C-alpha cells in the first residue's frame, strides 16, 4: 500500500516487547518499507487461502495475543533480511530485494510453518506440540533460507539433495539465531516447541541422534517416507556443519573448529557457487572443500577442518 513509513510497538509470541516498521494509510499496516522492496505480513484468519489480508491495525499498537504471531513473523523476517544483507551481501532471497511476504494464523491448530514457493506461512500450533511458529527466530530463518536455496542451488527436495536443502536451512536458521544473539543454540525450534517440556526441540545439530536422526552416513535412512528422509538424513550434514564450526571428536575422528562466521562463509559460497539441483552428499563435501579453498587457501586449516568434518560423518 502507498503511505508513510511509521514505527509501531507490540509483543511477540513469548511476551517480548519490540518495535516494528509499519506503513500508515488510514490503518497501520504490517509493511516495512526500510528493507528492499518491503516486508509484508498478512492475516490468514485461521483459513488456508493465501496470502490473506495485509495486516491492518487501528493504532499502531500490537499487544493483543492475536497480534503476537504477526509481530514475530514481521520482525524476524527483518532480522533474517539483515543477516543476509550484512553478512553475505545478499539483498532479500532472490538477491534483487524481492518483497518478503508472510502469512500467520494459517489454518487451525496447525503445527508447522513453511515456504510455499512465494511466501512464508506459519501455523499457530495446537498449544501442546507448538505455540505460534513465528515465535522461533530459527524457524523463521530456516524457512526463509528455503527461498534462498530455491533461487540459487535449487536443491531438489528429495533424497540426498533434499536432505542438503534441509540442512542448509538448519544451518542458516541457527546462524541467524546466533546473529540476533538471544539464547542461541544448535537445536531447532526450541522457543516454540512443547511449552510444557524444558530443553527439547524438533532437531539437534550438535547431536542429531538425540531425536533419532542419523549422525553418520552408514545410518542414513534409505526408505520413502518424508521424501526419502529429507528431515532425517539432514542430521548427517547438520553434524558435519556443527563439527566445522565447534570442533570435536566424532566416531574417533577429530575436527578442529573454525567458528560460526567461517562456517557461514563456506556454506554460503557452496550454496551459491557450487551446488546444483541434484547435488548428493559427496558432491556437497567437494563444494564445501572448493569453497573453503577459494576463501582461505588450499593448505588452510579451514580446508583441513571441512575434510575432517565430512570424514567424521562418513561422507567421502
Ligand atoms: Ca492495535
Ligand atoms: Ca535458542
Ligand atoms: Ca535454536
Ligand atoms: Ca519445549
Ligand atoms: Zn525445511
Closest ligand to C-alpha of residue 227 is 5
* 279 touches 272 (CB < 8 A): no
32 in a known ligand binding site: no
C-alpha cell at 269: 559460497
Query: In this structure, what CATH number is given to the domain that contains residue 15?
Result: 3.10.170.10
Q: Has residue 138 been placed in a domain?
A: yes
Q: Is 143 a catalytic residue?
A: yes
Domain of residue 121: give its range.
Answer: 6-154
Strand partners, 32: 39
The residue annotated as part of the active site, out of 119, 143, 160, 302, is 143
What is the spatial distance between Cα 297 and Cα 286, in angstroms, rounded to a whole number?
Answer: 15
Indicate if 160 and 237 belong to the same structural domain: yes
Q: Say yes or no: 88 and 181 in one domain.
A: no
Residues 6+ apart with CB under 8 A from 15: none
What distance in Å separates the CA atoms of residue 80 and residue 84, rounded to the nearest whole number?
A: 6
* 62 Cα–ligand 1 center, Å: 5
Q: Does residue 139 lie within any of the structural domains?
A: yes
Task: Please give, one letter per residue, the 3-state secondary structure of the chain.
Answer: CCCEEEEEEEECCCCCEEEEEEEEECEEECEECCCCCCEEEEECCCCCCCCCEECEECCCEECCHHHHHHHHHHHHHHHHHHHHHHHHCCCCCCCCCCCEEEEEEECCCCCCEEECCCCEEEECCCCCCECCHHHCHHHHHHHHHHHHHHCCCCCCCCHHHHHHHHHHHHHHHHHHHHHHCCCCCCEECCCCECCCCCCCCCEECCCHHHHCCCCCHHHCCCCCHHHHHCCCCHHHHHHHHHHHHHCEEECCEEECCCCHHHHHHHHHHHHHHHCCCCCCHHHHHHHHHHHHHHHHCCCCHHHHHHHHHHHHCCCC
> Do 144 and 209 reside in the same domain of the chain?
no
The CATH number of the domain where 250 resides is what?
1.10.390.10
Say if CB 155 and CB 161 are below 8 A apart. Answer: yes
190 assigned binding-site residue: yes
Contact 137, 177 (CB under 8 A): yes
Same-domain status, 167 and 306: yes
Q: For residue 10, report the distance from its CA to the centre of ligand 1, in Å.
A: 8
Regarding whether 148 and 24 lie in a shared domain, the answer is yes
Catalytic: which of 105, 216, 231, 250? 231
Q: Rounded distance, CA 278 to CA 6, Å?
A: 44
Q: Are 119 and 54 in contact (CB under 8 A)?
A: no
Query: At what resolution in Å was this solved?
Result: 2.2
Shared domain for 47 and 182, answered yes or no, is no
Ligand sitting nearest the alpha carbon of 180: 2
Where a domain ends, among 94, 120, 154? 154
Is residue 193 annotated as involved in ligand binding?
yes
Instruction: Indicate whether 116 belongs to any domain.
Output: yes
CA of 78 to the centre of ligand 1 (A): 20
Q: Which of 135, 154, 173 is the last residue of a domain?
A: 154
* Method used to solve the structure: X-ray
Q: Are residues 83 and 109 in the same domain?
A: yes
Ligand located closest to 128 CA = 4
Q: How many domains does the chain have?
A: 2
Q: Please report whether residue 233 resides in a domain.
A: yes
Cell of 298: 588450499
33 vs 6, 73, 310, CA distance in Å?
Answer: 9, 15, 42
Are 128 and 224 part of one and the same domain? Answer: no
Residues 133, 203, single domain; the answer is no
Residue 1, domain member (yes or no): no
313: CA distance to ligand 5 center in Å?
A: 21
Where is the domain boundary, 122, 154, 186?
154
With contact defined as beta carbons under 8 Å apart, do 90 and 84 qualify? Answer: yes
What phi and psi, each to the nearest 5 degrees, are found at residue 8?
Answer: -100, 180
For residues 287 and 199, membership in a common domain is answered with yes
Tell me how far the alpha carbon of residue 61 lies from the centroid of ligand 1, in angstroms: 4
Annotated catalytic, 160? no
Judgement on whether residues 109 and 161 belong to the same structural domain of the protein: no
Secondary structure (H, E, C), 201-252: CCEECCCHHHHCCCCCHHHCCCCCHHHHHCCCCHHHHHHHHHHHHHCEEECC
Angle between helix 281-296 and 234-246 (nearest 10): 20
Q: Residue by residue, what is the 3-state secondary structure of 114-154? A: EECCCCEEEECCCCCCECCHHHCHHHHHHHHHHHHHHCCCC
Domain shared by 76 and 163, yes or no: no
Residue 28 maps to a domain: yes
Amino acid at each position: 500500500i502507498t503511505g508513510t513509513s511509521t514505527v509501531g510497538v507490540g509483543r511477540g509470541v513469548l511476551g517480548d516487547q519490540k518495535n516494528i516498521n509499519t506503513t500508515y494509510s488510514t490503518y497501520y499496516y504490517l509493511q516495512d518499507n526500510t528493507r528492499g522492496d518491503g516486508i509484508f505480513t498478512y492475516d490468514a484468519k485461521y483459513r488456508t487461502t493465501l496470502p490473506g489480508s495485509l495486516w491492518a491495525d487501528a493504532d499502531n499498537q500490537f499487544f493483543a495475543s492475536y497480534d503476537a504471531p504477526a509481530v514475530d513473523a514481521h520482525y524476524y523476517a527483518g532480522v533474517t533480511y539483515d543477516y543476509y544483507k550484512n553478512v553475505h551481501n545478499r539483498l532479500s532471497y532472490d538477491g534483487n530485494n524481492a518483497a518478503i511476504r508472510s502469512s500467520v494464523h494459517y489454518s487451525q491448530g496447525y503445527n508447522n510453518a513453511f515456504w510455499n514457493g512465494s511466501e512464508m506461512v506459519y501455523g499457530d500450533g495446537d498449544g501442546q506440540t507448538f505455540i505460534p511458529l513465528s515465535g522461533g527466530i530459527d524457524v523463521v530463518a530456516h524457512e526463509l533460507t528455503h527461498a534462498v536455496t530455491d533461487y540459487t542451488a535449487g536443491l531438489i527436495y528429495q533424497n540426498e539433495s533434499g536432505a542438503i536443502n534441509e540442512a542448509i536451512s538448519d544451518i542458516f536458521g541457527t546462524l541467524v539465531e546466533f546473529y540476533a544473539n538471544k539464547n542461541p543454540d544448535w537445536e531447532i525450534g526450541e522457543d516454540v516447541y512443547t511449552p510444557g517440556i524444558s530443553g527439547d526441540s524438533l532437531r539437534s545439530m550438535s547431536d542429531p541422534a538425540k531425536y533419532g536422526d542419523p549422525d553418520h552416513y552408514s545410518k542414513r535412512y534409505t526408505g520413502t517416507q518424508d521424501n526419502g528422509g529429507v528431515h532425517i538424513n539432514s542430521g548427517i550434514i547438520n553434524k558435519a556443519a556443527y563439527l566445522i564450526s565447534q570442533g570435536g571428536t566424532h566416531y574417533g575422528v577429530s575436527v578442529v573448529g573454525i567458528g560460526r562466521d567461517k562456517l557461514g562463509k563456506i556454506f554460503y559460497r557452496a550454496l551459491t557457487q557450487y551446488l546444483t539441483p541434484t547435488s548428493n552428499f559427496s558432491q556437497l563435501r567437494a563444494a564445501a572443500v572448493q569453497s573453503a579453498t577459494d576463501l582461505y587457501g588450499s593448505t588452510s586449516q579451514e580446508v583441513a577442518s571441512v575434510k575432517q568434518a565430512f570424514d567424521a560423518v562418513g561422507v567421502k
